[PDB]
């Protein structure tokens, strides 16, 4: 009966932080004017308590309360290595 916090699927881009990782999520969609489908990425900052992620692994993250200054996500699961 919860309210279903936001979830994202991305690729780890950095792990050189104490229990914090950077996840890049990329996608395609059409240009607002010219209609061409363009690539854009968005970076995140997620909490990893166990430090169980390397670089380039496909991960799933969930939205949480503010855990730091610009750190609003936690690592739910790892889909690929």
């Amino acid at each position: 009966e919860r309210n279903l916090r936001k979830e994202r699927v991305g690729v780890v881009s950095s792990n050189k932080m104490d229990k914090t990782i950077t996840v890049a999520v990329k996608w395609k969609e059409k240009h607002p004017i010219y209609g061409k489908f363009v690539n854009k990425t968005k970076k995140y900052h997620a909490h990893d308590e166990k430090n169980e992620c390397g670089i380039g692994d496909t991960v799933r993250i969930m939205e949480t309360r503010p855990l730091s200054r610009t750190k609003r996500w936690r690592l739910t699961e790892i889909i690929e290595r």
Binding site: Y34, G35, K36, F37
Partner: protein, 131 residues
């Protein structure tokens, strides 16, 4: 090669403009589907698939009106090019020549024309306009 479908349309258009009776194209699955649609709608006289050691050859025999020496096909236009892909829903399916032409469209139910696409209520990628 950058756009095999546009190349197939260009081969057909050039053969029509030159007045040829038969045009040979390298074969592909989507090109075979387009040739089948053209034959069903009555734009080409006949077609034949040849499976040689290469990818194969589509041999198309064009249709000329002996009464007026005019080909059955007048315009062939590629819509969704590699540099700009176009997708429409079934509600916004294009109408070609005020319904007197066809719009070959690839849908999740297969490759068909805008008429059956509207009937089955499925959208997809607008391959080309023919009239």
């Amino acid at each position: 090669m950058t756009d095999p479908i546009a190349d197939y349309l260009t081969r057909l258009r050039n053969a029509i403009m030159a007045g040829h009776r038969v045009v040979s194209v390298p074969a592909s699955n989507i090109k075979k589907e387009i040739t089948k649609i053209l034959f069903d709608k009555g734009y080409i006289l006949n077609y034949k698939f040849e499976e040689n050691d290469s990818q194969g050859i589509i041999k198309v025999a064009l249709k000329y009106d002996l009464a007026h020496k005019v080909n059955a096909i007048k315009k062939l236009k590629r819509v969704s090019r590699p540099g700009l892909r176009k997708y429409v829903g079934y509600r916004d399916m294009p109408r070609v020549l005020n319904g007197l032409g066809i719009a070959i469209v690839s849908t999740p139910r297969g490759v068909m024309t805008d008429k059956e696409a509207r009937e089955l209520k499925v959208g997809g990628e607008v391959l080309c306009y023919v009239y």
